[PDB]
Design an enzyme around this catalytic site. Structure first.
Site, PDB file in Angstrom:
ATOM      1  N   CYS A 137      83.008  59.826  -8.377  1.00 10.35           N
ATOM      2  CA  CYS A 137      82.541  61.114  -8.903  1.00 10.35           C
ATOM      3  C   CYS A 137      82.310  62.146  -7.805  1.00 10.35           C
ATOM      4  O   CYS A 137      81.341  62.083  -7.068  1.00 10.35           O
ATOM      5  CB  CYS A 137      81.279  60.854  -9.711  1.00 10.35           C
ATOM      6  SG  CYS A 137      80.473  62.337 -10.359  1.00 10.35           S
ATOM      7  N   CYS A 140      79.181  64.302  -8.102  1.00  6.08           N
ATOM      8  CA  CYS A 140      78.032  63.569  -7.642  1.00  6.08           C
ATOM      9  C   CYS A 140      77.912  63.528  -6.122  1.00  6.08           C
ATOM     10  O   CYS A 140      76.836  63.774  -5.567  1.00  6.08           O
ATOM     11  CB  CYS A 140      78.108  62.129  -8.164  1.00  6.08           C
ATOM     12  SG  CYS A 140      78.456  61.941  -9.936  1.00  6.08           S
ATOM     13  N   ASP A 141      79.005  63.197  -5.438  1.00  8.60           N
ATOM     14  CA  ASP A 141      78.918  62.802  -4.017  1.00  8.60           C
ATOM     15  C   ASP A 141      79.628  63.719  -3.037  1.00  8.60           C
ATOM     16  O   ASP A 141      79.471  63.578  -1.821  1.00  8.60           O
ATOM     17  CB  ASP A 141      79.467  61.382  -3.873  1.00  8.60           C
ATOM     18  CG  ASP A 141      78.632  60.368  -4.599  1.00  8.60           C
ATOM     19  OD1 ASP A 141      77.393  60.538  -4.580  1.00  8.60           O
ATOM     20  OD2 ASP A 141      79.204  59.414  -5.168  1.00  8.60           O
TER      21      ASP A 141
HETATM   22  C1  LIG Z   1      79.391  55.578  -9.517  1.00  7.91           C
HETATM   23  C2  LIG Z   1      78.959  56.692 -10.448  1.00  7.91           C
HETATM   24  C3  LIG Z   1      77.966  57.582 -10.070  1.00  7.91           C
HETATM   25  C4  LIG Z   1      77.558  58.608 -10.942  1.00  7.91           C
HETATM   26  C5  LIG Z   1      78.209  58.763 -12.277  1.00  7.91           C
HETATM   27  C6  LIG Z   1      79.212  57.860 -12.635  1.00  7.91           C
HETATM   28  C7  LIG Z   1      79.601  56.835 -11.764  1.00  7.91           C
HETATM   29  C8  LIG Z   1      80.694  55.862 -12.162  1.00  7.91           C
HETATM   30  N1  LIG Z   1      77.764  59.807 -13.147  1.00  7.91           N
HETATM   31  C9  LIG Z   1      78.335  60.029 -14.501  1.00  7.91           C
HETATM   32  C10 LIG Z   1      77.384  59.401 -15.517  1.00  7.91           C
HETATM   33  O1  LIG Z   1      77.285  58.007 -15.210  1.00  7.91           O
HETATM   34  C11 LIG Z   1      77.896  59.541 -16.953  1.00  7.91           C
HETATM   35  O2  LIG Z   1      78.098  60.925 -17.187  1.00  7.91           O
HETATM   36  C12 LIG Z   1      76.862  59.032 -17.908  1.00  7.91           C
HETATM   37  O3  LIG Z   1      76.506  57.691 -17.575  1.00  7.91           O
HETATM   38  C13 LIG Z   1      77.363  59.109 -19.337  1.00  7.91           C
HETATM   39  O4  LIG Z   1      76.279  58.778 -20.167  1.00  7.91           O
HETATM   40  P1  LIG Z   1      76.545  58.171 -21.632  1.00  7.91           P
HETATM   41  O5  LIG Z   1      75.211  57.994 -22.252  1.00  7.91           O
HETATM   42  O6  LIG Z   1      77.583  58.995 -22.283  1.00  7.91           O
HETATM   43  O7  LIG Z   1      77.332  56.782 -21.369  1.00  7.91           O
HETATM   44  P2  LIG Z   1      76.911  55.505 -20.435  1.00  7.91           P
HETATM   45  O8  LIG Z   1      78.196  54.951 -19.893  1.00  7.91           O
HETATM   46  O9  LIG Z   1      75.838  55.824 -19.416  1.00  7.91           O
HETATM   47  O10 LIG Z   1      76.266  54.417 -21.433  1.00  7.91           O
HETATM   48  C14 LIG Z   1      77.061  53.764 -22.405  1.00  7.91           C
HETATM   49  C15 LIG Z   1      76.162  52.766 -23.129  1.00  7.91           C
HETATM   50  O11 LIG Z   1      76.892  52.320 -24.272  1.00  7.91           O
HETATM   51  C16 LIG Z   1      76.739  50.917 -24.415  1.00  7.91           C
HETATM   52  N2  LIG Z   1      77.836  50.345 -25.193  1.00  7.91           N
HETATM   53  C17 LIG Z   1      79.175  50.405 -25.002  1.00  7.91           C
HETATM   54  N3  LIG Z   1      79.795  49.656 -25.960  1.00  7.91           N
HETATM   55  C18 LIG Z   1      78.833  49.130 -26.758  1.00  7.91           C
HETATM   56  C19 LIG Z   1      78.790  48.270 -27.944  1.00  7.91           C
HETATM   57  N4  LIG Z   1      79.958  47.834 -28.451  1.00  7.91           N
HETATM   58  N5  LIG Z   1      77.571  47.969 -28.458  1.00  7.91           N
HETATM   59  C20 LIG Z   1      76.442  48.415 -27.909  1.00  7.91           C
HETATM   60  N6  LIG Z   1      76.394  49.219 -26.822  1.00  7.91           N
HETATM   61  C21 LIG Z   1      77.552  49.586 -26.246  1.00  7.91           C
HETATM   62  C22 LIG Z   1      76.626  50.388 -22.982  1.00  7.91           C
HETATM   63  O12 LIG Z   1      75.952  49.136 -22.829  1.00  7.91           O
HETATM   64  C23 LIG Z   1      75.812  51.514 -22.348  1.00  7.91           C
HETATM   65  O13 LIG Z   1      74.404  51.291 -22.403  1.00  7.91           O
HETATM   66  C24 LIG Z   1      76.752  60.668 -12.704  1.00  7.91           C
HETATM   67  N7  LIG Z   1      76.295  61.682 -13.456  1.00  7.91           N
HETATM   68  C25 LIG Z   1      75.343  62.506 -13.011  1.00  7.91           C
HETATM   69  O14 LIG Z   1      75.037  63.428 -13.779  1.00  7.91           O
HETATM   70  N8  LIG Z   1      74.771  62.382 -11.769  1.00  7.91           N
HETATM   71  C26 LIG Z   1      75.150  61.417 -10.898  1.00  7.91           C
HETATM   72  O15 LIG Z   1      74.639  61.264  -9.733  1.00  7.91           O
HETATM   73  C27 LIG Z   1      76.170  60.458 -11.357  1.00  7.91           C
HETATM   74  N9  LIG Z   1      76.587  59.442 -10.560  1.00  7.91           N
END
Ligand SMILES: Cc1cc2c(cc1C)N(C[C@H](O)[C@H](O)[C@H](O)COP(=O)(O)OP(=O)(O)OC[C@H]1O[C@@H](n3cnc4c(N)ncnc43)[C@H](O)[C@@H]1O)c1[nH]c(=O)[nH]c(=O)c1N2
Ligand SMILES: Cc1cc2c(cc1C)N(C[C@H](O)[C@H](O)[C@H](O)COP(=O)(O)OP(=O)(O)OC[C@H]1O[C@@H](n3cnc4c(N)ncnc43)[C@H](O)[C@@H]1O)c1[nH]c(=O)[nH]c(=O)c1N2
Ligand code: NA
Ligand code: NA
Lengths: 315, 315
Positions: A137, A140-141
């Site tokens: 991201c 983010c970084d």
């Molecule tokens: C390495 C890295 C670092 C960052 C980021 C990404 C990554 C990869 N991001 C982006 C951020 O992670 C992303 O925007 C959010 O996590 C999205 O939030 P959601 O709630 O949409 O999905 P998110 O992916 O967080 O959560 C999905 C949830 O759905 C659940 N799920 C999936 N399938 C399921 C099923 N069948 N039954 C039950 N549960 C299920 C999962 O267990 C999980 O709890 C970020 N953003 C930011 O704003 N600042 C930052 O510093 C960062 N840093």
């Protein structure tokens, strides 16, 4: 386990979208249940350095932030359930979900917040250097790479966007892509390639990310492989951004809810409504544009308020 | 004061939308300046009890939260300027703003985050009982009135929406409106009036909100006045929700940017783009639907990311 259990609202997912939906639904007395899934707390669980989620003066760790949200949600009356949804029946009322536990969940409205995980190359060295020069991201970084030389891996719209963003911050950007050209909108591609501090290595992959021993392990270079000839070369770099795309968590909804051409769930403009009334989708499962915790939390809020309005309209 | 000062991005407003835009713009190295306006910290400055902004396990005070955002924004490189914008030139490049200070600000992209304040009746007793039974946000405070009797004042779509929301939480809702009928969508109005726990007092106003001495002062009733006859009556109540509408802060942009029929700034779907490229609008100045801090913060993020993408496209 329980045979069957009803809540007025069920939220599938416990990232910032799901928790925010739960907070608002609980405060509207809709007694929501959150199905946590495989990664309670969502994708922020794998970062220790969050600096752009508004409301924290200093940097926080992802797990700490997501614990605060989980606590908040339960404090206001949401209930978090440790289960994974394996099937959803979208054509019945109340909606019916099957858990891996065997429990049948039913709900009057459904909020989908299942996320869209960044894809990775599959290298052990990605893990080794995670947060020490490997990122997925740039928003983010990127800031940390001010005046540094970085590599971006990928060649779709995401890679082009991430590289363009970084080209304005980093001293240089080297894009590495396995094909001979980008598979991205031509205007964007031309704009990126014309930047004086951007270069490209076509027909190649990252063979390995190189760096120091974990005292954390810090990136200092990459080994690239030409996938036509197999020839390798090694280069110095300060950071590697993996930008090969995201995988919306939509396997429950394929063939049941409208999807955008890239797999993301379709929702209505300025809304979390899917093409089935009473089913809403919030966060990165639908948002292929912003992809941030705060935008995901905002959509969670929207979904709860819309769900509440919709339920009132059914009564 | 300074004659003239340029920043790549200027944000007008220091509520959650403005600060979030500033955080993201600063982390993209766009060196943003935030013009704080008359109320640094925005409308959350007048509440001591925030419980639905995701990421805080326990309730917080509005001023405390907004101080954290201000600190965060300056920590990541934004600069907050104490001034009020009095004019904006939307047809020139760079965009030009005039401050009340006399300073001319210029910017390559502009983010408008000026808010939309709740309107009040203008009663001294509204202030006296603020946060002790007087509210202008049912989403925010409705939860506390579980099984209590409340009054909603107003008769437009906002009042109908707020009353319908509260009808599901409160034991009863009494709507007080100065006309003989609602000026709201007929389907919504019919839905509200058919609720068994909803009553209406037409052709009337709140003459005074009644309650205990400030030891806080707590609402115990209202005096209503029929505006046809002048006759008054007094009734017991536990809470009063003022739902007469909001005033988007759009006086700078009237005749210059597209507005929606109700005065709010128009923005593109799933976007903060106004009808002038390079001018974005975020938060309650454009969002007449959700009106929450987290949705406002989410839009601020969107505006910064869009501004960054747009600026890259100009280079
Ligand atoms: C390495 C890295 C670092 C960052 C980021 C990404 C990554 C990869 N991001 C982006 C951020 O992670 C992303 O925007 C959010 O996590 C999205 O939030 P959601 O709630 O949409 O999905 P998110 O992916 O967080 O959560 C999905 C949830 O759905 C659940 N799920 C999936 N399938 C399921 C099923 N069948 N039954 C039950 N549960 C299920 C999962 O267990 C999980 O709890 C970020 N953003 C930011 O704003 N600042 C930052 O510093 C960062 N840093
Ligand atoms: C009593 C009460 C209580 C609550 C709430 C409202 C009210 C009235 N809200 C709603 C919340 O206040 C609202 O959604 C946000 O404040 C909107 O944030 P913005 O950033 O859009 O505008 P906001 O109104 O916060 O900020 C506008 C900013 O623009 C500036 N500005 C305006 N004109 C300007 C000019 N010409 N030049 C420079 N600056 C200018 C102002 O000075 C101000 O800093 C809420 N939400 C929630 O989620 N949880 C809650 O508990 C509450 N509680
Ligand atoms: Na949508
Ligand atoms: Na919009």
């Amino acid at each position: 386990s329980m045979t069957q259990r009803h809540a007025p609202v069920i939220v599938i997912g416990s990232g910032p979208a799901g928790y925010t939906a739960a907070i608002y639904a609980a405060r509207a007395m809709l007694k929501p249940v959150v199905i946590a899934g495989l990664q309670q707390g969502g994708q922020l669980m794998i970062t220790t350095d969050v600096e752009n989620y508004p409301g924290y003066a200093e940097p926080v760790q992802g797990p700490w932030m997501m614990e605060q949200m989980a606590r908040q949600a339960e404090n206001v009356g949401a209930q978090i359930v440790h289960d994974i949804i394996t099937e959803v029946e979208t054509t019945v009322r109340p909606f019916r979900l099957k858990g891996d536990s065997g429990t049948i969940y039913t709900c009057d409205a459904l909020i989908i917040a299942t996320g869209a995980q960044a894809k990775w190359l599959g290298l052990e060295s990605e893990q080794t250097f995670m947060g020490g020069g490997v990122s997925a991201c740039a928003t983010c970084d990127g800031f940390f790479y001010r005046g540094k030389d970085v590599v971006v891996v990928g060649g779709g719209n995401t890679a082009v966007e991430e590289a363009l963003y970084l080209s304005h911050i980093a001293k240089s950007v080297t894009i590495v892509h396995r094909r001979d050209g980008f598979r991205a909108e031509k205007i964007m591609q031309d704009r990126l390639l014309s930047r004086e501090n951007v270069s490209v290595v076509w027909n190649s992959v990252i063979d390995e990310i190189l760096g120091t021993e974990a005292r954390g392990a810090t990136v200092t270079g990459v080994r690239l492989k030409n996938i036509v000839t197999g020839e390798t070369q090694e280069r110095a770099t300060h950071g590697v951004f993996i930008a090969i795309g995201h995988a919306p968590a939509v396997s429950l909804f394929e063939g049941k809810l409208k999807q955008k051409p890239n797999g993301y769930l379709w929702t209505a403009p300025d809304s979390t409504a899917t093409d089935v009334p009473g089913i809403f989708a919030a966060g990165d499962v639908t948002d292929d544009i912003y992809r941030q915790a705060v935008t995901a939390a905002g959509m969670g809020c929207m979904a709860a308020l819309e769900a509440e309005r919709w339920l009132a309209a059914q009564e």
